[model samples]
Target chain A: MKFTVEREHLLKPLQQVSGPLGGRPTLPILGNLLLQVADGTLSLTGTDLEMEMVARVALVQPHEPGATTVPARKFFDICRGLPEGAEIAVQLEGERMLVRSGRSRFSLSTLPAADFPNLDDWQSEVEFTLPQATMKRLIEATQFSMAHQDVRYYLNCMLFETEGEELRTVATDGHRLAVCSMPIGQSLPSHSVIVPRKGVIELMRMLDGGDNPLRVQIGSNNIRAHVGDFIFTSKLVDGRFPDYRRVLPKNPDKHLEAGCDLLKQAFARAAILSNEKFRGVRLYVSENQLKITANNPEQEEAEEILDVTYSGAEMEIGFNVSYVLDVLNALKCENVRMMLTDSVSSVQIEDAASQSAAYVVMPMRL
Target chain B: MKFTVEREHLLKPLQQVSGPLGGRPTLPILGNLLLQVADGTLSLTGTDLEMEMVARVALVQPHEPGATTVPARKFFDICRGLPEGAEIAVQLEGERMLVRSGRSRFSLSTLPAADFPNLDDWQSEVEFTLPQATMKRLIEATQFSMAHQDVRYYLNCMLFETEGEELRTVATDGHRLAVCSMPIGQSLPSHSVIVPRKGVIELMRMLDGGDNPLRVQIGSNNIRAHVGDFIFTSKLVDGRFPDYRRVLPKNPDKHLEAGCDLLKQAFARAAILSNEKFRGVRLYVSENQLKITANNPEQEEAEEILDVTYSGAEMEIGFNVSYVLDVLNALKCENVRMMLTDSVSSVQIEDAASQSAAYVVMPM
Candidate 1:
């Protein structure tokens, strides 16, 4: 393969695909990124068998079209260090690839492109389109709740469900659950797909929050999303997600509304004295006031008081400080409303002005 | 002990002494800083047995005068995080030290001051005074030559020598030697002392170019420099330093003068292809130009040339690039003269404009 391209154009796509390449892999081919030039376009693909990424760029002047694989990391390092606006030329000679720009020349060893593994080509069973901004918002709101290395394998992925005219993304780590929904103009097929942890994170970075639309294709074993010139694909987990709808309460007996900024600060101060092993903060709710208290193993206590608008029966509850802070920080609201049934039931946290985003956090025994 | 002082005054001394307290010491008391308050004067001392630093903050209101030691690192951390300009009151209460400032309080565990190790106290055999700027210049010229973790322990320190109404500082790692000398205004006994590695570095940060004078006191086994209110003491290395005068040639038969900037740039460009192990660059010197060449193990070569005014014999010499760069960068001279005896002998590098500062680097 022979082609000449500007340094800037190749750098962005190369960086996107090179993230999954391993320094030392069990299979030597996994350390290389496959490059294919055909029909005046160059496609770069990288995979570790668990996660895969592909990016394409159109060439200014396309010469002999062919395919080859080269060292992903070394190629990126040399290109990045070159002076900007320099034109780079790449040509394949036998088993070696020659790279030259200005006064620098590098002869890199290459492997046959046929040795690269192709991801499983599963047929798409459901297809839909959504605005990139809406998709980005949904992922941003719920991605933090995905469990890492959980024994319940299904919890290690996010649940993507679309039905009727709305799309919902839900993730939970048994301690807290985040669910966000957005209305799509086009109707989506009734379906649910479990995207593995790595795939969900990669898609979140590639998707931009703008008016541009993103096309998503879901298969039985894999999922792919086409955004701009990048095709992001991930292997789906074959397990059943827990019933998260049952985890939320229909009606909470005790409810309180308070300034989000004030509540967030109070929680931060109380965390300073919380036990290191189990970070538990107790909340005491009464008429027009909310009190937070935390004590460590040394019996050192920290307390904070915040003003609220509530006139209900006095109740006390315990929760993880980090979970409450996560919901408050992501909601971007002026005021927050919290509802608790009792000390044993899950608590619901939502923005006081909006109902589209809500969080449910389980309680810790005090 | 009880006293109230501004947080700014106390924080400076705390930070200067925290570097010597590491995790793997034999005695726990060594990890603490000794705090002594007497006659309305507060003194803080930290030491690793080889070098000791003592800083004093006067002009304080003292309620009770006593002495104690606390964990140096923990105390410093808490003080640094407190609000600035707060008046901190520290008092000794039983075995705990109570530190109270505006809206903040801490009870730090303390150890008796008697448990701290005291360095040897020696009377000053030779004493002199010099401007802080002169002392700082002497250190900056020679500090980079001090060896780290060298088997020859004496080379790990900088040798301070006073002889014939001139004070000189010299440091060498057996490969290159750096020497800087200044004229002393008063006559004094000739003496030499090797300041330990850590003590030399700490002294560098404390001596800034100002109108203040630094008092130097040299003893038989210890050296002390008084800067501002701090008394910095360090134990001298007991080994004998090599006679650097014998290694420096009085007059060389051949000489070359070149622009320091042009030579430094040529050396840097050639260093990119130098061998990783030795970092050696080959120099080809002729009548009016100097050429530098470097080659890696992979057979890639980098070469550069610079014009100079030289009417000497043509010669080819190889030297470490880092050594040449160090001397060139430190001299701060536009034009530098190089005196050479032969290809294998030590070459003397001196500024063409200044004669007091001279450097001798042995060819590799």
Candidate 2:
């Protein structure tokens, strides 16, 4: 389109809109970004048929308006190569797009913008607004446990459920599960949907975690989020998610409280000597001492002991050291409280000061 | 072996000695580092038959003297995992090596020290001493041009030659050659040797660019350097290096002087649009102006124009932009002077301020 914009004004939005472009596109048009300027505004849209992102920047002065598509990567690189604060002018020629800034010029290949696919039309069933900080925490605290490329397709996404005044996010890979909830401060109709892995990651990157309001719309087949100047939409996974409540441990007879940093460091050292394949470590729990031991097939052994607060009968439990370390790292608190029923059942770990987030790790039979 | 050493004293030397250990060893002992404690000093040695590095840390007190070998990677990890300043007490117990610190313990597997291969020995034929900083610059300036896994085996090493009062290093991959030299400030017998690629890289990592005196010994089959507490030895390549003087551009009529920084930036941007396969860019030179143009097979084009100092007739030359960028990057100067004969001959690039280093890029 024949319009002028600042390098700073277009670079960030261009990067955000192009985030959904995959490495290998099924069609040539899928690799191109649609650039349209109309009514004194320039919008960039990128999609792969299943998900789409649109970023818009308002033009300060009105000019000739038109549309075209260019290679996303080259266009971004050209803008980046230009010096900051440089004015970028773009004009459409008969079959090419000319980009000029300072003493440099680029004639980029383009395809007709009409060939870009539009996401399927759907009606919004529920709409709500939540603080960006709350939404960010709800996703960051639970996303790490999501299954990747699982045959049970629903498990490959994070489950977002709304009931009463609380919003909950749950993810499980059949071995370890993370459940986090935050108060929405408003009542809404109960609903649950599975957001694909890629969409969840993109949303996390776009959130700045301030108190700004983020508007969200959910439908039967898709979900949309309006984040500042960018709009994000993704197709929801259609399969049903397994009941995560069954994995939650009930009241366990044994409980232990220890410093998060101390436990994290101890597990890390023990992991170094763990079996390369299984990564199993044994924990010896006694009156007031917690001992960690690991040994590989090579007969190399590592043992670490730390002072902990425990009063239950002496017991030994084996777990994948990585799983335990992940839980301890996720719980950002001075002290962590863990509930265990036995060696066979899962252990529930959470922040001692606040119980808004809880992590469950299944024991490994080493 | 029984000894106690602080983590700081043992960690660095362990890392250095283990630098020569390859990922896959021909023998089990090749993957292990030899640890020997004798006469109140602990020495760690690692070798892959072609090269060997030994790092020694003086012990404050010693009780039992013994020797053993342990997996290099695992031992380094254990020492790194320990808290700083913690005393690591190592003891040889039967078939295992027990390493204990504060409240943590690691039982590592080990092989007998006698099984480690020893590099063949050679008598020193020449000896010299050079400042570490000078040696570092000589290698850093020309190492990038060394051939990698070429069929011409001699091209995969840097030619180190000493004559009169200057030490020079030269490397080329047949297409481009880089030559750098620095005055040793003392006369010495002329000598030339080709240091293998792995040896040159390891020696580069060990130099710290200071005025410390580095004692170097040249033998028939090996080159060794005494770098502080570390003893480095490497097997030399037994082949004659091509005479680099033949590639040096003779006195040329056309010469251009330009700011190194400006030209480097322009070339980098032009590289983005160059052909992904050949990475070729065209330079149009005339009076007081330089234009860079690149086009890919897709017909996309990028053109940049910059002001430069020129007095000769207009000329067009093509280069694998990367070669030009490499010289500009290595110069580290405010201005660079280039001397060219024609479109098909080699071009010479050097810093306007110094002649200690010169670079020649054969035209493509």
Candidate 3:
């Protein structure tokens, strides 16, 4: 592959595709990124056989149209290390790829393009488009609840359920559940795809790309998301997922309303004294007031009394502080409502008035 | 002990004195900071038996005068976590200290102030004053060469030599040496003391506090640098330091003058391809240009060619790229002059026009 382009044009796309892999790659070519010149364009692709990222850049000048594989991390470093706005010259000679910019020249080892593993052609059965912000909100509101390498396996993924113009996302690690939904103009075939945690996370990383719309295509075993000129594809995990709706609590007798910021701060301070191992915190509710208390084995205690808007009978509940913190911190809003019936049940926390995003966590037996 | 003060006034002195210890304390009192109240003044002190830092803050409301010790790190955090301009009230309640500001309160466990190890009184025989900027500049240029836990224990410290109005600081790890000097108004009594690496680092951290002169006092086993309200005392390294002047490479036949920024950037780029173990980069000097080349075991190579003013024979020499980078970065000058005779000789790097700071690296 012989090509010459501005360093600025290639650095961004190269960085997006060259990394973000899972663990150590098994194949030599898997650790390398494929560079191809076709249709008067230079495209870079990186994958670990499960998830793939491809970025295309417009070349100011294209020599011979060819393809080659370069070690992703090192190649990206060299491109970034060059002077800004410097024109970069790249050429493939035998098994080495030469990159030149200004007074610097780097000859990097390369693997043949034939050895690189590319994801299968995605025959998308259902496709739709939504604003990047909408999709970003859908991912952010529920992505944190996904399981981490659990044996139940299916819990290690996020459920993307869409029917007609309304799209919903649900994730649960058995103890907590997060559900978020958004509306799209186009109708999508009723489908339920379990996207692995890594792909779900990678998509979330690019959610702040302004108001541009992002397109997602769902296939039998793979899902592809098109963000601008970048394409992200991931293989779906086939397994049975639990019913997230069953874990979400309904309106109960006792509910407390407070400012999300104020509650977050109180929880953080109270956490400093919580049990080191269990991280359990007690929430005591009374008339127009809420009290947070935590104590460790050392007898060290921390208490925070917040003037909350509540009228329920005095009730005390134990919960993992971090679980409640995650949802409150993620929901960028002014007020939040926490509802629960008793000490041994799921507590639903959501925007005081909105239903676009909601969270539910099981109360721990402190 | 009881006192009330603005959180901001106490935070700075607490942060400055609560750290600088190297490890977990062997005694509970060693893990705490002393809070002493006397003469309408409050001071916080922290030490690890070897080194101690004492900082005094003005008290807005001084109550019953007394002394106590509280867990250093935790107390500092509680003081910092409060609201801005919060009126912090600290009171001694039995074995605990009750700290209250606004609605937030923290009761920290404490030890007796008598158990906290305070540095023994030093009857300093020699004392002088220098600009904070002058002392700061002297330390910055030579501090990087101090050894890290080497068997030659003295190599792990910086040698402070002063004689007849001239003060010089030198450090070496046998592989490289850095020396810097400046003029002090009064001549020191031809004395030399070796300050351990940790003490040199801590003093450097606080050198930027206004140009108000800093007072330094030398004792038998301690060196104290009094900057503003902060008194930093460190236990001196007891071993003898090496004679540093012997390593200066004499007037050499070949010399290279170039922009420090350009060479630093070239070396950084070439470092990417250097051997991961030794980080060796070859410098090839020809008629009017310099070529930098490096390659790793992976058969990957990087080369940079820069136009330089030179008339020496074409030469190829290998040096650790980072060593060159450190000196160039520290010098902070527009131009650097490198003097050497051959590949096997030591390379002396210094300013192209000044002689106050000099550095030498044994060719690798």
Best by TM-score: 2
Q: Kindly report the fnat of each predicted structure, to 2 decimals.
A: 0.00, 0.68, 0.37
Better of 1 and 3 by lDDT: 3
The order by descending lDDT is 2, 3, 1
Specify the poorest-scoring 10-residue window by lDDT in model 1 chain A.
A297-306
- How far in Å is the alpha carbon of B16 misplaced in model 1? 4.9
Error of 2 at A167 (Å): 2.2
lDDT of each residue in A205-297, candidate 3, tens digit only = 655477667899999999988888788888999988887767777656577889989888788777776777788998888898888888787
Q: Which digits, one per residue and each the tens of the lDDT, describe model 1 over residues A194-294?
A: 99887887888777565667999988888889988788888888988877789898778677999888677667656755777788999888899888888
TM-score-based ranking, best first? 2, 3, 1
Per the 3 Å backbone cut-off, how many clashing residue pairs does candidate 1 have?
A: 0
DockQ of candidate 1 (2 decimals): 0.12
Comparing to the true complex, what docking class would candidate 2 get? medium
Distance from true location, Cα of A15 in model 3, Å: 0.5
Q: What is the lDDT of residue A313 in candidate 1?
A: 87
Consecutive 10-residue window with the lowest summed lDDT within model 1 chain B: B17-26
lDDT (Cα) of model 2: 0.88
